[PDB]
């Protein structure tokens, strides 16, 4: 027969695919993009004052930060209703914002004795081993006294420069602008951001009851030890009161069905290990079902963990005059999104197993399968020279171009050169002699000498496969 | 006199490079 095995496995997979696609449509709503877009435009893309033109994403000094804090920040947080604050007359600001500072201590570094006279004090780069832990300034409140990470319920962040801690000098702002302005003015008067500060975070969250969807906001400016300011931002639209409407019940049923399907796939894949052939891993169609099963199990575990610890919401709802600590849920939401996206991609890729219904598709599948070894053999020789070029660019230009500032940036810049996106208008001034040589030689040796070998291999293999299957038919 | 310093979050590249070369020259050999 053999028709009752290749067709049952198809029908038991199409249901899995439609369930997964239903969940995917359920996650990504169209009411999410505009929410984030309006919030981002309100907070990042407005000038700090009517006179200056520097918005948040173009901070260049520590004094501009103080213009932003008492300025376009308070101008966006607190709105007068037409007491509580509704940010767009729709989004409710729940709780109070928090501002936290990370700083180091003088004498963490050593200045050489030769020039020790002119240099008085030095502050090292940020590291947990050299982090200040002593009171400073007027030791009255909680903004001048170190507090441990466990006493803030904080966690690391992995910023652009370093991986900052969760402990520091924090201060909770007020529910009304007339008090937050006074608090920030008091902070500015007695210098709170001196030369020793290394990072400064601002956190708050909103609700927008029209569509049940929270949104947590984090704003980070980090001052490196070499001077300057590096701003960063993050807006995450969570959803924590999910079971409200009928569609939510339908999605819950879909998740339960997905869990049953994953259990079925686990048992029907472990049945083909000990009952049948073992170490059959030279197939690529059974090395892909294990990936799907593992990723789905990880996603189920992550979802259970991130929905089984929601005590922060109830704790905040009991007393609604404190800072709502939603910064942990917004991390697991990101991880869940990444895992779900990768799992969906691999499930969609798995469809290639079931398209061989005629000769014109079997020929293409065989052509793809027979040239994989040759392509893998050439890809190593291609990528060795690719990485040699990347490291050469990193060492030569990697200080003054920005596009080659790190190894990953070099790799992506070279890929964009292959696409023909970037032009060498800025490479030349970085180095007069090696500017044009690198560009022209890279293009010459990676655009029509080593890039055409893939085309040659693929064309030759396709011609050979078609010739062989034609000659096979020429004996009937 | 065994100690547990762990005083830095940085990485030393000389030891890593030396070990990597001493292992690749064994694999190919
Ligand atoms: C920090 O310590 C150095 C000595 O290592 C001292 O010269 C400097 O004045 C100190 N900084 C402040 C703000 O007191
Ligand atoms: C702490 O803040 C209070 C606020 O009134 C004020 O007395 C002063 O600025 C600081 N120092 C002390 C000792 O209170
Ligand atoms: C940390 O969480 C506890 C609840 O486990 C809470 O009582 C405490 O206030 C939180 N820390 C801060 C600084 O709010």
Swiss-Prot record, chain A:
Mutation: residue 382 to P; reported impact is:
Gain-of-function mutation resulting in increased channel activity. Absence of gain of function. Increased channel activity
Residue ranges annotated as intramembrane: 410-424
Q: Which residues bind Ca(2+) 1?
A: 419
Where does this chain carry the motif Selectivity filter? 419-421
Q: Where is the protein situated, by its record's location annotation?
A: Cell projection, Cilium membrane; Endoplasmic reticulum membrane; Cell membrane; Basolateral cell membrane
**Origin: domain of life:** Eukaryota
Keyword vocabulary terms for this entry: Calcium, Calcium channel, Calcium transport, Cell membrane, Cell projection, Ciliopathy, Cilium, Coiled coil, Cytoplasmic vesicle, Disease variant, Disulfide bond, Endoplasmic reticulum, Glycoprotein, Golgi apparatus, Ion channel, Ion transport, Membrane, Metal-binding, Methylation, Phosphoprotein, Potassium, Potassium channel, Potassium transport, Secreted, Transmembrane, Transmembrane helix, Transport, Ubl conjugation, Voltage-gated channel
Family, as annotated: Belongs to the polycystin family.
What is the purpose of this protein? Forms a nonselective cation channel. Can function as a homotetrameric ion channel or can form heteromer with PKD1. Displays distinct function depending on its subcellular localization and regulation by its binding partners. In primary cilium functions as a cation channel, with a preference for monovalent cations over divalent cations that allows K(+), Na(+) and Ca(2+) influx, with low selectivity for Ca(2+). Involved in fluid-flow mechanosensation by the primary cilium in renal epithelium. In the endoplasmic reticulum, likely functions as a K(+) channel to facilitate Ca(2+) release.
Give residue ranges on the Extracellular side: 28-246, 305-330, 398-409, 425-432
Q: What results from changing residue 459 to A?
A: Constitutive active channel. Reduces but do not abolish ion channel function. Reduces but do not abolish ion channel function
The protein's assembly and partners: Homotetramer. Component of the heterotetrameric polycystin channel complex with PKD1; the tetramer contains one PKD1 chain and three PKD2 chains. Isoform 1 interacts with PKD1 while isoform 3 does not. Interacts with PKD1L1; probably forms a Ca(2+) channel. Interacts with CD2AP. Interacts with HAX1. Interacts with NEK8. Part of a complex containing AKAP5, ADCY5, ADCY6 and PDE4C. Interacts (via C-terminus) with TRPV4 (via C-terminus).
Q: Which organism is it from?
A: Homo sapiens (Human)
- Whichever gene encodes this chain, its name is PKD2
One GO biological process term: cell surface receptor signaling pathway
Describe the effect of residue 455 to N.
Gain of function mutation
Question: Which disease is this protein implicated in?
Answer: Polycystic kidney disease 2 with or without polycystic liver disease: An autosomal dominant disorder characterized by progressive formation and enlargement of cysts in both kidneys, typically leading to end-stage renal disease in adult life. Cysts also occurs in the liver and other organs. It represents approximately 15% of the cases of autosomal dominant polycystic kidney disease. PKD2 is clinically milder than PKD1 but it has a deleterious impact on overall life expectancy.
Name of the protein in question: Polycystin-2
Curated annotation (Swiss-Prot), chain B:
- Organism classification, top ranks? Eukaryota, Metazoa, Chordata, Craniata, Vertebrata
Where in or outside the cell it occurs: the entry states: Cell membrane; Cell projection, Cilium; Endoplasmic reticulum; Golgi apparatus
**UniProt subunit comment:** Component of the heterotetrameric polycystin channel complex with PKD2; the tetramer contains one PKD1 chain and three PKD2 chains. Interacts with PKD2; the interaction is required for ciliary localization. Interacts with PKD2L1. Interacts with PRKX; involved in differentiation and controlled morphogenesis of the kidney. Interacts (via extracellular domain) with WNT3A, WNT4, WNT5A and WNT9B. Interacts with DVL1 and DVL2. Interacts with NPHP1 (via SH3 domain). Interacts with BBS1, BBS4, BBS5 and TTC8. Interacts with RGS7.
Quote the protein name from its UniProt record: Polycystin-1
Determine the domain of life of the protein's source: Eukaryota
Protein function: Component of a heteromeric calcium-permeable ion channel formed by PKD1 and PKD2 that is activated by interaction between PKD1 and a Wnt family member, such as WNT3A and WNT9B. Both PKD1 and PKD2 are required for channel activity. Involved in renal tubulogenesis. Involved in fluid-flow mechanosensation by the primary cilium in renal epithelium. Acts as a regulator of cilium length, together with PKD2. The dynamic control of cilium length is essential in the regulation of mechanotransductive signaling.
Q: What is known of its domains?
A: The LDL-receptor class A domain is atypical; the potential calcium-binding site is missing.
Q: How is it modified after translation?
A: N-glycosylated.
Family from the record = Belongs to the polycystin family.
Associated pathology: Polycystic kidney disease 1 with or without polycystic liver disease: An autosomal dominant disorder characterized by renal cysts, liver cysts and intracranial aneurysm. Clinical variability is due to differences in the rate of loss of glomerular filtration, the age of reaching end-stage renal disease and the occurrence of hypertension, symptomatic extrarenal cysts, and subarachnoid hemorrhage from intracranial 'berry' aneurysm.
Q: Which stretches are transmembrane? A: 13-29
């Amino acid at each position: 027969k053999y028709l009752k095995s290749v067709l049952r496995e198809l029908v038991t997979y199409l249901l899995f695919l439609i369930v997964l696609c239903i969940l995917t449509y359920g996650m990504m709503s169209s009411n999410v993009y505009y929410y984030t877009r309006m919030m981002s435009q309100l907070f990042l893309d407005t000038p700090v004052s009517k006179t200056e033109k520097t918005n948040f994403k173009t901070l260049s000094s520590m004094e501009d930060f103080w213009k932003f804090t008492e300025g376009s920040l308070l101008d966006g947080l607190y709105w007068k209703m037409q007491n509580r604050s509704f940010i767009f007359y729709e989004n409710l600001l729940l709780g109070v914002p928090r501002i936290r500072q990370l700083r180091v201590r003088n004498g963490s570094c050593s200045i050489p004795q030769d020039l020790r006279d002119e240099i008085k004090e030095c502050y090292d780069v940020y590291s947990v081993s050299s982090e200040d832990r002593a009171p400073f300034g007027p030791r009255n409140g909680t903004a001048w006294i170190y507090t441990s990470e466990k006493d803030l319920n904080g966690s690391s962040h992995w910023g652009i420069i370093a991986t900052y801690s969760g402990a520091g000098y924090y201060l909770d702002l007020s529910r009304t602008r007339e008090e937050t302005a006074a608090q920030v003015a008091s902070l500015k008067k007695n210098v709170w951001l001196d030369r020793g500060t290394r990072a400064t975070f601002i956190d708050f969250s909103v609700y927008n009851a029209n569509i049940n969807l929270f949104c947590v906001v984090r704003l980070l400016v980090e001052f490196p030890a070499t001077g300057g300011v590096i701003p960063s931002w993050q807006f995450q639209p969570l959803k924590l009161i999910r079971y409200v409407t009928t569609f939510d019940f339908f999605l819950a049923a879909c998740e339960i069905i997905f869990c049953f399907f994953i259990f079925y796939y686990v048992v029907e894949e472990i049945l083909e290990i000990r009952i049948h052939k073992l170490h059959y891993f030279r197939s690529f169609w059974n090395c892909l079902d294990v990936v799907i099963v593992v990723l789905s199990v990880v996603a189920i575990g992550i979802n259970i963990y991130r929905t089984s610890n929601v005590e922060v919401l109830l704790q905040f709802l009991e007393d609604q005059n404190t800072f709502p600590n939603f910064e942990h849920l917004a991390y697991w939401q990101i991880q869940f999104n990444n895992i779900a996206a990768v799992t969906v991609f691999f499930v969609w890729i798995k469809l290639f197993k079931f398209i061989n219904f005629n000769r014109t598709m079997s020929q293409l599948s065989t052509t793809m399968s027979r040239c994989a070894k040759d392509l893998f053999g050439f890809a190593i020789m291609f990528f060795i020279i690719f990485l040699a070029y990347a490291q050469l660019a990193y060492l030569v230009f990697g200080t003054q171009v920005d596009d080659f500032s790190t190894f990953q940036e070099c790799i992506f810049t070279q890929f964009r050169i292959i696409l023909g996106d970037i032009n060498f208008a800025e490479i030349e001034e970085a180095n007069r002699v090696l500017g044009p040589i690198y560009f022209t030689t890279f293009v010459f040796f990676m655009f029509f000498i080593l890039l055409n070998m893939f085309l040659a291999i693929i064309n030759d293999t396709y011609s050979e496969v078609k010739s062989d299957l034609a000659q096979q038919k020429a004996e009937m | 006199r065994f100690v547990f310093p762990e005083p830095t979050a940085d990485v030393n590249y000389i030891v890593m490079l030396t070990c990597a070369v001493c292992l690749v020259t064994y694999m190919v050999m």
